């Protein structure tokens, strides 16, 4: 009916007027490119050959445009169409049209998209305005859009099959509007939370943490190689930190050349002892924690997500607020390039040896689990003998469940702390967690010590069968193993019942995600 | 032992599963009866006398790993991965490229992908034997380094060796089949397969009609680029209208098979199958058996890839940052077990709940073959030759080529066709 044509999503009002399919748009898969700048995006040649930009023939660009017209649609840097003053579109694809190749002022050559063009880049859903940003085109081989890895966080994009839409402005007026209102360097700091949207991420973050340790010393050739990738370099090699016995620069000394202008910042590393600030060695910091950037020089400290990440007061945020957006763009790009080459030198990996802990650590974990299971048994016996008394506001069932959960969680935390004590400096799980690049101490603990309690709907694994969780367990078993506690680590391997309970927990998480998407989308539409 | 010995001689002993059921040794139990039955996961661990948990076991599981389905049964060491990762691997294993059937040549199916050189996993679950994964495998074993090499493996992408790709690594064939039926609807209006003529047929296109044979159908073995005319069909106009089928844009294939038959109605019916050989590009999607996928970030030649002392360069480099948050430790255990199996010559056993295969035992086995216990290896930088300071985890892991390829997804629009009702750009 006529109402159905106009009514809902896919109706005229919303599906054809509020939003509509548009020309000069391209979609393809995205892959990483550390070598591109923040604002640069990588465009395949085919996408750039299909999409066109109309350029008015002026006396100063008539020669170049006539050359492009001569090349035609076939040769890549060419023109698809010529729009006359009357509006007649001569077609350069179909037949030479030798008389109609002539250009005069006022004609519009629809040239192919070239390097330096401004394009809007989009990922669905566009939750915030950083999800559509203006990027400067760079044409690269192969068929994927290539974007800098600092720009992944605003788009919420990972290179695991994601795709991105690309919209090309078709007028100089709208091109200027896009360039000024939406360019990526102008979008670094969000108005939502007055923090930078973008920060150093993934390999660069871990390699920055490793690079800025006191231990890192770079010889002459490595220093020159790294300075090669610093675009803002003044051409002057800093005097090395250690002149004799052999000239050796420091990672901080070279990173001080990255920091632009004169930027002042004080942060603290994630593994900063709380005692250090109160006690002596406030400004010496035996662990080389803390972070002090004076006059744009990294005097002391190890950088992590707290210093180079997306948080208020970070070195990135201070650079944007002090030196401007262009210099901050250069800052991001230089960090990524020189630290990625140093990472080519030092290297990074994850292996089984990271998951393994000491034999003493495993023994302590086992003892903690034994003591916890014994304490849960004691609590169950107290409840069975009716010694247990209800906690105010809770039933006897609820207070028993809370006591058992407290015991199991405390044991889980103690095993996790033991596993984390086991971690060496060389451990790579610890490297990624400390840098903040990926992972958490929870993940380390589950990998090494104990997966933990599997809970569904905020309770331990329910009695799905008649008065028992699985047929293998006896009826009315409230012990840790029966109700879902997984004492084996991922490295050790879950036992079959633990495997099923873990599957129940993971299923609940997946269901939560899938259900969440639609409700949040409806709320967002209503608010807007 | 009598039952097991007779089943072991199964053929030429005429003893089968039904005889095992008839003997009363095994029994079928449904969920309602599962509610009233005491089960033991294993006989030895549970039935045998110990501190008595239960002394009234009425049944015993044949093997715990049977709780998994077909797609989850290929996951090696699934008990060492996070639970959502096994769901992801089930979904992605439904999308891996392999030899789907042995009669694929006879079948003319639209959208068929078949891999050049499928391999059976070096680390395999026992239940794979009953899934026929050895007979029709989907994926290749590949030397994989978990390292941060040039930043092109960051996020979830994967660096690949271009030399290996050039030697046949993950090369596939994509068959697209087009069907066209000549039919008569009006008594004077009929459709005929014929080579369209510029003058005789009113409707025509710039697309080349020369490749069409006399019958109006391209012969097999003719290269057909995008928008060329596969089938030439003309309709009498009560001069003629062109309803000829064209290639899907950017197909760029070679005709494989052209079959001409009569359908149920008796009208002539033509099926034409087109081969496109797809080499891995830097957009294509590859996934391990542990629920972590990624597009090819870049391809480096063998000279550029990092190399070990022995001269081995990883076929695939995956970012280490994938492992920690996802906690797919089965990936690492599979790399270690694959290294052990490839050096030993056996095929590793990755059944979910073996309890006889620890990580420590695999490490001790790997030590005997001259490698580091934990599988790390001193890697030399391909570009400069200097040893990489951090020793890098390398091993043979089984990887699958998912059907999602960049060439199928790349699209661009510029003043193209437009819908009739909305007069807005079209969809798709």
């Amino acid at each position: 009916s006529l109402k159905q044509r106009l009514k809902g999503k896919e109706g005229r009002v919303r599906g054809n007027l509020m939003g509509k399919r548009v020309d000069f748009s391209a979609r393809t898969v995205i892959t990483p490119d550390p070598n591109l700048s923040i604002d640069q995006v990588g465009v395949p040649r085919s996408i750039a050959a299909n999409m066109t930009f109309a350029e008015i023939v002026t006396p100063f660009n008539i020669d170049r445009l006539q050359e492009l017209v001569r090349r035609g649609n076939s040769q890549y840097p060419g023109a698809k169409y010529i729009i006359r003053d009357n509006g007649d579109r001569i077609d350069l694809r179909f037949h030479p049209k030798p008389s109609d190749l002539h250009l005069q002022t006022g004609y519009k050559v629809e040239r192919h998209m070239c390097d330096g063009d401004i394009v809007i880049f989009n990922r669905q859903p566009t939750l915030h305005k950083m999800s559509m940003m203006g990027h400067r085109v760079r044409i690269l081989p192969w068929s994927t859009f290539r974007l800098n890895l600092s720009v992944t966080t605003p788009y919420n994009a990972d290179f695991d099959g994601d795709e991105m839409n690309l919209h090309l402005p078709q007028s100089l007026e709208t091109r200027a509007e896009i360039q000024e209102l939406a360019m990526v360097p102008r979008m670094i700091v969000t108005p939502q939370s007055n923090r930078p949207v973008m920060g150093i991420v993934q390999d660069t973050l871990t390699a920055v943490r490793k690079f800025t340790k006191r231990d890192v010393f770079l010889e002459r050739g490595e220093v020159m190689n790294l300075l090669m990738f610093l675009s803002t370099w003044d051409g002057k090699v800093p005097q090395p930190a250690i002149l004799k016995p052999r000239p050796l620069w420091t990672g901080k000394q070279i990173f001080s050349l990255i920091i632009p202008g004169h930027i002042n910042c004080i942060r603290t590393h994630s593994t900063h002892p709380d005692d250090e600030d109160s006690g002596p060695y406030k400004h010496i910091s035996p662990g080389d924690t803390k972070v002090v950037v004076e006059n744009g020089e990294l005097i002391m400290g190890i950088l992590c997500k707290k210093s180079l990440g997306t948080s208020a007061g970070s070195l990135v945020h201070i650079s944007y607020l002090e030196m401007g957006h262009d210099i901050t763009r250069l800052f991001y790009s230089n960090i990524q390039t020189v630290i990625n080459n140093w990472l080519l030198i030092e290297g990074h990996t994850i292996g089984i040896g990271d998951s393994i802990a000491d034999s003493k650590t495993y023994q302590d974990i086992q003892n903690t689990i034994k003591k916890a299971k014994q304490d849960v048994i004691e609590v169950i016996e107290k409840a069975h003998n009716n010694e247990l008394e209800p906690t105010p506001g809770n039933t006897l069932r609820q207070t028993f469940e809370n006591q058992v959960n407290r015991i199991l969680n405390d044991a889980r935390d103690k095993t996790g702390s033991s596993a984390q004590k086991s971690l060496s400096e060389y451990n790579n799980f610890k490297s990624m967690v400390v840098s903040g690049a990926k992972g958490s101490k929870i993940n380390i603990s589950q990998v090494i010590a104990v997966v933990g309690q599997q809970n569904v709907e905020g309770k331990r694994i329910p009695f799905g069968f008649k008065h028992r969780t699985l047929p293998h367990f006896i009826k009315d078993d409230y012990g840790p193993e029966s109700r879902g506690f997984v004492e084996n680590s991922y490295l050790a391997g879950l036992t079959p019942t633990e495997f099923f309970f873990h599957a129940m927990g993971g299923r609940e998480g997946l269901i939560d995600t899938a259900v969440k998407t639609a409700e949040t989308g409806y709320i967002q539409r209503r608010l807007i | 032992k009598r039952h097991i010995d007779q089943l072991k001689e199964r053929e030429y002993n005429n003893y089968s599963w039904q005889d095992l059921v008839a003997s009363g040794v095994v029994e079928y139990i449904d969920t309602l009866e599962e509610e009233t039955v005491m089960l033991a996961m294993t006989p030895d661990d549970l039935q045998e006398k110990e501190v008595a948990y239960c002394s009234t076991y009425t049944h015993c599981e044949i093997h715990p790993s049977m709780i998994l389905g077909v797609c989850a049964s290929i996951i090696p060491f699934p008990d060492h991965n996070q639970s959502p990762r096994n769901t992801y691997q089930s979904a992605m294993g439904k999308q891996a490229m392999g030899v789907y059937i042995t009669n694929f040549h006879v079948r003319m199916d639209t959208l068929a992908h078949v891999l050049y050189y499928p391999q059976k996993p070096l680390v395999t679950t026992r239940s794979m034997e009953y899934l026929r994964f050895r007979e029709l495998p989907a994926g290749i074993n590949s030397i994989v380094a978990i390292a941060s090499y040039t930043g092109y493996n960051q996020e979830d992408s994967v660096i690949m060796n271009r030399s290996a790709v050039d030697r046949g690594f993950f090369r596939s064939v994509f068959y697209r089949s087009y069907k066209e039926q000549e039919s008569k609807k009006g008594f004077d209006q009929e459709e005929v397969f014929e080579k369209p003529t510029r003058e005789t047929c009113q409707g025509m296109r710039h697309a080349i009609y020369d490749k069409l044979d006399d019958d109006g159908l391209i012969a097999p073995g003719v290269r057909v680029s995008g928008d060329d005319v596969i089938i030439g069909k003309t309709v009498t106009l009560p001069t003629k209208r062109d309803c000829s089928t064209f290639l899907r844009t950017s197909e760029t294939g070679i005709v494989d098979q052209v079959m001409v038959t009569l359908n149920q109605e008796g009208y002539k019916f033509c099926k034409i199958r087109v081969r496109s050989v797809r080499i891995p590009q830097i957009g294509d999607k590859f996934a391990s058996r542990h629920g972590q996928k990624g597009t090819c970030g870049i391809q480096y030649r063998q000279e550029d890839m990092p190399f070990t002392c022995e001269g081995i360069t990883p076929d695939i480099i995956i970012n280490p940052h994938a492992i920690p948050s996802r906690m797919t430790i089965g990936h690492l255990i599979e790399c270690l077990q694959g290294k052990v199996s490839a050096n030993k010559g056996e095929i590793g056993d990755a059944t979910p709940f073996n309890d006889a295969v620890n990580v420590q035992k695999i490490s001790n086995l790997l030590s005997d073959y001259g490698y580091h216990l934990r599988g790390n290896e001193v890697l030399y930088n391909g570009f400069t030759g200097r040893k990489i300071t951090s020793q890098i985890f390398i091993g043979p892991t089984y990887y699958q080529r998912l059907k999602h390829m960049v060439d199928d997804k790349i699209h661009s629009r510029a003043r193209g066709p437009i819908q009739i009702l909305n007069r807005q750009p079209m969809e798709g």
Binding site: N405, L408, N409, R412, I442, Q446, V451, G452, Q453, Q454, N455, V456, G458, K459, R460, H502, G505, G506, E508, G509, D512 | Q82, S83
Partner: peptide
Amino acid sequence: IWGIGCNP
């Protein structure tokens, strides 16, 4: 999958 206070 961790605990009651964590995640499932």
